[PDB]
Amino acid sequence: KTKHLKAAFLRYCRKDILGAQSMVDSLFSDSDMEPDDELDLAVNQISVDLIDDYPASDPRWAESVP
């Protein structure tokens, strides 16, 4: 959902600065779904939706980390 994409976009914000916190919010993202055929295509539509906001205007990951 929109909350998950907006939580990965906030972990990329911290990835420019340090990795340890953002690696635990990827380890907590192994509290995912894990059925290959469409829910891994539901974190796909998240990584794709951020590669469409990084070519757009100011990307919605920005604000917290400038």
Next chain:
Amino acid sequence: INLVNNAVRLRILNCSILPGGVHICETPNNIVVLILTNQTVHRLILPHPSRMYRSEIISDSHIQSIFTDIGKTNFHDPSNTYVIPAIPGRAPNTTASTAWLSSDGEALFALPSISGGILVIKMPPHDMEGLVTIAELKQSSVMQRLLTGWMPSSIRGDQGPAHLPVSLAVHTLDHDSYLFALCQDHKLRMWSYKDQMCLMVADMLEYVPVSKDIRQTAGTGHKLRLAFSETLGILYLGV
């Protein structure tokens, strides 16, 4: 909307499912499926639809059924499955059953006993460790209770096969569960589960244009339904 993964085939090996042995109960968080067989009782816990979706922005093409995650439920958990003991046990060849959730989230299953009473199996709440408990509801006269120590069972009038429930229904009010039993003797009986007592006995033949022959024949085709009006606070019984 077309739901994804909206169908499940459950096979309970060696156990035949009872006619009317499937009951669905809704709670603010979960859908609970209660299943009675000839030998076992089962509880399935599924997420409520309002809890599956936290975001208003779901593309219609990916709306999942409550069944999508059913393969993650541990069906071998003793909290979710119980084997019905042979004594006091279920009456052979009966189809009457009812199941419900208590106010406390306990799963209750009611079935005809071999003794002509109602056998009630109570499973603990799904989130609590507990033992399955068994209660048998019997019409004991106060005279049968007081004389329990002085006369052998042969004079006591064992509840003959004529007392066997043919249709069971339940209504939950406050903190009690009222069981309605339409029996082979054409009588409707009402039970409090909490007080373990018969509160009402009505003879259904008082409302039928009686032929003298009906009183001698076991009523095997009888059906009972309940409907409750929350707005009026009134319980109706269709017989």
